[PDB]
Design a protein around this motif. Structure first.
Motif, PDB file in Angstrom:
ATOM      1  N   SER A 153       1.476   4.003   8.660  1.00 10.69           N
ATOM      2  CA  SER A 153       1.224   4.579   9.973  1.00 10.69           C
ATOM      3  C   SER A 153      -0.196   4.215  10.388  1.00 10.69           C
ATOM      4  O   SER A 153      -0.878   3.434   9.716  1.00 10.69           O
ATOM      5  CB  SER A 153       1.447   6.098   9.960  1.00 10.69           C
ATOM      6  N   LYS A 155      -2.580   6.115  10.086  1.00  8.01           N
ATOM      7  CA  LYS A 155      -3.433   6.699   9.060  1.00  8.01           C
ATOM      8  C   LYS A 155      -3.480   5.868   7.784  1.00  8.01           C
ATOM      9  O   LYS A 155      -4.152   6.269   6.827  1.00  8.01           O
ATOM     10  CB  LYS A 155      -2.961   8.119   8.740  1.00  8.01           C
ATOM     11  N   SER A 156      -2.782   4.732   7.740  1.00  2.00           N
ATOM     12  CA  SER A 156      -2.825   3.827   6.597  1.00  2.00           C
ATOM     13  C   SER A 156      -3.084   2.396   7.049  1.00  2.00           C
ATOM     14  O   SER A 156      -2.577   1.447   6.447  1.00  2.00           O
ATOM     15  CB  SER A 156      -1.534   3.904   5.785  1.00  2.00           C
ATOM     16  N   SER A 158      -6.121  -0.448   8.477  1.00  2.77           N
ATOM     17  CA  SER A 158      -7.542  -0.766   8.604  1.00  2.77           C
ATOM     18  C   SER A 158      -7.681  -2.251   8.908  1.00  2.77           C
ATOM     19  O   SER A 158      -7.426  -3.089   8.037  1.00  2.77           O
ATOM     20  CB  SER A 158      -8.305  -0.394   7.337  1.00  2.77           C
ATOM     21  N   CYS A 242       2.126   8.901  13.160  1.00  2.00           N
ATOM     22  CA  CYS A 242       1.629  10.199  12.723  1.00  2.00           C
ATOM     23  C   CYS A 242       0.278  10.504  13.360  1.00  2.00           C
ATOM     24  O   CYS A 242      -0.618   9.660  13.371  1.00  2.00           O
ATOM     25  CB  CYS A 242       1.513  10.236  11.199  1.00  2.00           C
TER      26      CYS A 242
ATOM     27  N   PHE B 120      -6.572   5.598   2.553  1.00  2.00           N
ATOM     28  CA  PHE B 120      -5.348   5.705   3.334  1.00  2.00           C
ATOM     29  C   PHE B 120      -4.608   6.971   2.929  1.00  2.00           C
ATOM     30  O   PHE B 120      -4.755   7.455   1.805  1.00  2.00           O
ATOM     31  CB  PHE B 120      -4.440   4.483   3.130  1.00  2.00           C
ATOM     32  N   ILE B 121      -3.808   7.509   3.847  1.00  2.00           N
ATOM     33  CA  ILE B 121      -3.027   8.710   3.580  1.00  2.00           C
ATOM     34  C   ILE B 121      -1.598   8.498   4.065  1.00  2.00           C
ATOM     35  O   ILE B 121      -1.367   7.883   5.111  1.00  2.00           O
ATOM     36  CB  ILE B 121      -3.660   9.965   4.224  1.00  2.00           C
ATOM     37  N   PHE B 122      -0.642   8.998   3.284  1.00  3.82           N
ATOM     38  CA  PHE B 122       0.783   8.845   3.553  1.00  3.82           C
ATOM     39  C   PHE B 122       1.422  10.225   3.587  1.00  3.82           C
ATOM     40  O   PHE B 122       1.315  10.982   2.596  1.00  3.82           O
ATOM     41  CB  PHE B 122       1.456   7.967   2.497  1.00  3.82           C
ATOM     42  N   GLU B 217       2.462  15.945  14.068  1.00  3.42           N
ATOM     43  CA  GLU B 217       2.470  14.560  14.525  1.00  3.42           C
ATOM     44  C   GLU B 217       3.645  13.794  13.928  1.00  3.42           C
ATOM     45  O   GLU B 217       4.387  13.113  14.647  1.00  3.42           O
ATOM     46  CB  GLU B 217       1.148  13.880  14.165  1.00  3.42           C
ATOM     47  N   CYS B 218       3.825  13.893  12.617  1.00  3.68           N
ATOM     48  CA  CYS B 218       4.913  13.211  11.927  1.00  3.68           C
ATOM     49  C   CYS B 218       6.255  13.892  12.175  1.00  3.68           C
ATOM     50  O   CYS B 218       7.098  13.388  12.919  1.00  3.68           O
ATOM     51  CB  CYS B 218       4.637  13.158  10.426  1.00  3.68           C
TER      52      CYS B 218
END
Lengths: 242, 218
Positions: A153, A155-156, A158, A242, B120-122, B217-218
């Motif tokens: 997403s 958020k992952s 860069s 997200c 990073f975050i999942f 959001e998700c």
């Protein structure tokens, strides 16, 4: 060239009896001819073990004549046998519990005070080792993993690069193998060592970084293989917002 | 309890190839030099004997491995480090009195420049949520040194006792590390909150880095 080979694997419930064997190649145990080097009675066939968060532990030793010597921490549950009819020696550990999980090596220790001609290097040490047999003791039953998609997403991401992965959760025992796109994707892959949860089951992650623009063009599948449960799972990691 | 206890130092040695490496092994009581042995160990591979008897090299051990000692303190020295020499090194007393105990081991690490991790975050997947559980993953990619602090915050509240961490071996390419942290809650405990954040502290970061998301959001 003297080599040791260890066959099998260990999967035991608590209180059961572990039995591991080691086969010698390149030297005979029924050869009572001492004409050079050290006597074959100076060889002490040794069992050693190591748990993931612990130091190596000398389990014990047995010699060609049958004389055994056991670590006092294990000596009450440990038996050691040897036979020159197959050039093999074995360890039997009773009353196994969760604390006995680990890698079990066989080795050849050498303790010689006398020799004919030359003392070969490696005296007073374990000069020949086996590759290691994995042994897992647990109350858990064999369970194949659940593979969940760590979806890429915003958020992952860069700089045109996005991370995406697979969460291989709640499986037993070790190990599992993870490939991406049936092996055709290898660059930038990180597969993490499994962590044992308090439930007795293992969990790990496998991540890979790909171009962001390719997420609409390429389809990414993670192939998880768990041999003890005879399972292979191909999971498609679809992008998300997200 | 008559057993000799060996203790190795340092826990981790960080050097570059071609440098000089020195590993110390201290015994609780004096051991004869004739009964002190060193072993090399690489993950997945069997341990290999290096120094044995009175500081004598084992079979196929190059001349850059040497050993010394006084009975209470022993030292394994690598004059110049080849790339193949970065591994674990153990000491053991063998021949004096059973049991033949080992040291806790010393890791030899490649020393490179400081590299900041990519964070990073999942979020959880619908597949996992339909089973009654939610796992949020935080990935730190390619960093050095290995010292890094990963904290989970749920509605700005620090979590403790519901997360697990895992670190990879040192990369054979860029000699960096990677870390994966998994925070696991029940579907109820998960849906009772909104904001989930992963806070990262590392030497290569001036201030900590936060990667967060709203469950809506998700």
């Amino acid at each position: 060239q003297v080599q040791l080979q260890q066959w099998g694997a260990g999967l035991l419930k608590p209180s059961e009896t572990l039995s591991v064997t080691c086969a010698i190649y390149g030297d005979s145990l029924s050869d009572y001819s001492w004409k050079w080097g050290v006597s074959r009675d100076d060889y002490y066939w040794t069992w050693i073990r190591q748990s993931p968060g612990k130091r190596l532990e000398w389990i014990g030793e047995i010699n060609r004549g049958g004389n055994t010597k056991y670590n006092p921490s294990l000596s009450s549950r440990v038996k050691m046998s040897i036979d020159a009819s197959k050039n093999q020696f074995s360890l039997r550990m009773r009353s196994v519990t969760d604390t006995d999980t680990g890698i079990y090596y066989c080795a050849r220790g050498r303790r010689s005070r006398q020799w004919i001609g030359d003392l070969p290097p490696g005296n007073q040490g374990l000069d020949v080792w086996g590759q290691g047999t994995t042994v897992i003791v647990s109350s858990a039953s064999t369970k194949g993993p659940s593979v969940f998609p760590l979806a890429p997403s915003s958020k992952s991401t860069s700089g045109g690069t996005a991370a995406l992965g697979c969460l291989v959760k709640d499986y037993f025992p070790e190990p599992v193998t993870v490939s991406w796109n049936s092996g055709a994707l290898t660059s930038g892959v990180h597969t993490f060592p499994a962590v044992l949860q308090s439930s007795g089951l293992y969990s790990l992650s496998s991540v890979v970084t790909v171009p962001s623009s390719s997420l609409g063009t390429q389809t990414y599948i993670c192939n998880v293989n768990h041999k003890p449960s005879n399972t292979k799972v191909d999971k498609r990691v679809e992008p998300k917002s997200c | 309890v008559h057993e000799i206890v060996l203790t190795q130092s340092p826990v981790t040695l960080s050097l570059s190839p071609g440098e000089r490496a020195t590993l110390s092994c201290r015994a609780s009581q004096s051991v004869s030099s004739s009964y002190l042995a060193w072993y090399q160990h690489k993950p997945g591979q069997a341990p290999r004997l290096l120094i044995s008897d009175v500081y004598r090299r084992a079979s196929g051990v190059p001349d850059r491995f040497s050993g010394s000692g006084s009975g209470t303190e022993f030292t394994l020295t690598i004059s110049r480090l080849e790339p193949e020499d970065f591994a674990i090194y153990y000491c053991q007393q063998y021949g004096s009195s059973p049991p033949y105990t080992f040291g806790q081991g010393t890791k030899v690490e490649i020393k490179r420049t400081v590299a900041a991790p990519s964070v990073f975050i999942f979020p959880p997947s619908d597949e996992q949520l339909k089973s009654g559980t939610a796992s949020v993953v935080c990935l730190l990619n390619n960093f050095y040194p290995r010292e890094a602090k990963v904290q989970w915050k749920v509605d700005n509240a620090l979590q403790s006792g519901n997360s697990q961490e895992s670190v990879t071996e040192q990369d054979s390419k860029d000699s960096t590390y990677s870390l994966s942290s998994t925070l696991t809650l029940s579907k109820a405990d998960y849906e009772k909150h909104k904001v989930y954040a992963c806070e990262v502290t590392h030497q290569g970061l001036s201030s900590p880095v936060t990667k967060s998301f709203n469950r809506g959001e998700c």
